[PDB]
Design a protein around this ligand. Structure first.
Ligand SMILES: Cc1cc2nc3c(=O)[nH]c(=O)nc-3n(C[C@H](O)[C@H](O)[C@H](O)COP(=O)(O)OP(=O)(O)OC[C@H]3O[C@@H](n4cnc5c(N)ncnc54)[C@H](O)[C@@H]3O)c2cc1C
Ligand SMILES: *[C@@H]1O[C@H](CO)[C@@H](O)[C@H](O)[C@H]1NC(C)=O
Length: 467
């Protein structure tokens, strides 16, 4: 109403957080333009076969550690969102042979232990690397170094173990991933090694909503955010920035003025042509944008006439050691989370995600049936009655699921990513210093971006030195 005006592009986690931090400081003249018809962004639930499941973020990652993960209190104490600790101690008993049945546990255990040791030496190595990133390498290069081979895990069991250890976490193979920025990982180093599966019918998005209703006006009766400051179905298509101020044009031809703009759209959106910047963003910034990775993590859901898979102690997570690396490999059954549901969850990432998103649900269901018959022969496995294939990559407002730190990108040029250009500020998981790719990362990045601008608006200090 009175003071500087900031336009926040996008009402995701970091978007909502940023505006909240801005409000708190006094900058209340905010306008949040959100492309979709809902806040939450990549924190989004949907109805699959009469239950609510997550399309996007599904875990609170990093719990029980030396520092409190800011999302965990909100999830466990404040909203008391239904969630369960994920236990992976029994994967050794649950790795399926490409053709028929499981491997000898004692065998698989060796391979897991071996894999863990190679990664532990990765940590030692990573701890010695110069902070300039000068002597950084891919996770694979390290793996090769320890295993004394021209290659990383090359055999069906080893690979699915490798996939589970890395791909299943970062949504890209070890060979594209920076050793120095994932091994070890601050998310786990700081907040603990535990991850917690949110399975609450309100949605994991309830966290975003909770935060949003601490500064945005909500209807006393229904609870729906009624604040005129949040505008849904507003698709920012052009940002005009000059010494004087900023213009923000949306897709319906509205043009807005403000003193500053906070961009919370994903790295993939920035990488696309969705938001045009006039004038064009400096080279240094563009090169930072296009060198970072916007990975794709696809959570394929399936429902079945009956339950043909093992349930009980250490049965939640099972692997499929395909000879075609990353082929329908990581499986999750929901006996605890959605009792009597008959839903399985297979995760694919990266190269496979792009294929699968592009093909018909039927074609996919077909492929998955085949695999499931091989995993459980001498059982009668019914065709899946329903399939869900989240198409995040294909979606213009996301163009991926989360960022991954790639080999080549050093700490400096990562900072160029978060750096502002004029009155154009950036936020989102991909700007998060130590927690890119994560809900908390997005959440904390909101606060940091906000504070950077607040420091400029109020304290009148606006030179940002990239480091
Ligand atoms: C499949 C998947 C699984 C994941 N797994 C985990 C996990 O379980 N645990 C965890 O901690 N994190 C995980 N994440 C990552 C986590 O979801 C993100 O780090 C976090 O949600 C990012 O929030 P954000 O505000 O940075 O981006 P977003 O949530 O994408 O916010 C951007 C918002 O801007 C909007 N938008 C984009 N373009 C425009 C525009 N042109 N105009 C106006 N609005 C625009 C979008 O609609 C969106 O609402 C997962 C993500 C996905 C999708
Ligand atoms: C979450 O809440 C439960 C049940 O109220 C409580 O016992 C526990 O302290 C919390 N769990 C974690 C991991 O913080």
């Amino acid at each position: 109403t009175v003071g500087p005006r900031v336009i926040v592009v996008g009402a995701g986690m970091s978007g909502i957080s940023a505006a909240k931090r801005l409000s708190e400081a006094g900058i209340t003249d905010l306008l949040i333009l959100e492309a979709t018809d809902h806040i939450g962004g990549r924190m989004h639930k949907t109805n699959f076969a009469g239950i609510n499941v997550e399309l996007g973020a599904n875990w609170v990652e990093g719990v029980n550690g030396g520092k409190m993960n800011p999302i965990w209190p909100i999830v466990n104490s404040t909203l008391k969102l239904r969630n369960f600790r994920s236990d992976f101690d029994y994967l050794a008993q649950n790795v399926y042979k490409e053709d028929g049945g499981v491997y000898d546990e004692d065998y698989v255990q060796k391979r897991i232990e071996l894999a863990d040791s190679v990664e532990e030496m990765g940590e030692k190595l990573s701890a010695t690397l110069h902070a300039s990133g000068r002597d950084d390498m891919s996770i694979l290069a390290m793996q090769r170094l320890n295993e004394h081979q021209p290659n990383g895990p090359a055999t069906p069991v080893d690979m699915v173990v490798d996939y589970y250890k890395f791909d299943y976490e970062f949504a890209e193979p070890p060979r594209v991933t920076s050793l120095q920025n994932t091994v070890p990982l601050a998310t786990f180093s700081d907040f603990g090694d535990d991850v917690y599966f949110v399975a609450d019918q309100r949605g994991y998005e309830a966290v975003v909503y909770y935060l949003a209703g601490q500064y945005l006006k909500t209807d006393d009766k229904s609870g729906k955010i009624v604040d005129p400051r949040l505008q849904l179905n507003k698709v920012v298509r052009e940002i005009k920035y000059s010494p004087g101020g900023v213009t923000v044009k949306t897709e319906d031809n509205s043009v807005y003025s403000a003193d500053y703009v906070m961009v919370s759209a994903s790295l993939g959106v920035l990488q696309s042509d969705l938001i045009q910047f006039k004038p064009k963003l400096p080279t240094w910034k563009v090169r930072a944008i296009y060198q970072f990775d916007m990975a794709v993590y696809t959570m394929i859901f399936l429902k079945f006439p009956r339950k043909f898979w093992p349930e009980g102690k250490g049965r939640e997570f099972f692997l499929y050691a395909s000879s075609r690396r990353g082929y329908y490999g990581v499986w999750q059954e929901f006996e605890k989370q959605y009792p009597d549901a008959n839903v399985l969850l297979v995760t694919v990432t990266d190269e496979e995600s792009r294929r699968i998103e592009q093909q018909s649900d039927e074609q996919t269901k077909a492929e998955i049936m085949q695999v499931l018959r091989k995993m459980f022969p001498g059982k009668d496995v019914p065709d899946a009655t329903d399939i869900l294939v989240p198409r995040w990559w294909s979606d213009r407002f996301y163009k991926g699921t989360f960022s991954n730190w790639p080999v080549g990108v050093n700490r400096y040029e990562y900072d160029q990513l978060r750096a502002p250009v004029g009155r154009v500020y950036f936020t989102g998981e991909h700007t998060s210093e130590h927690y890119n790719g994560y809900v908390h990362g997005a959440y904390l990045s909101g606060i940091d971006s906000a504070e950077i601008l607040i420091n400029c608006a109020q304290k009148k200090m606006c030179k940002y030195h990239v480091q």
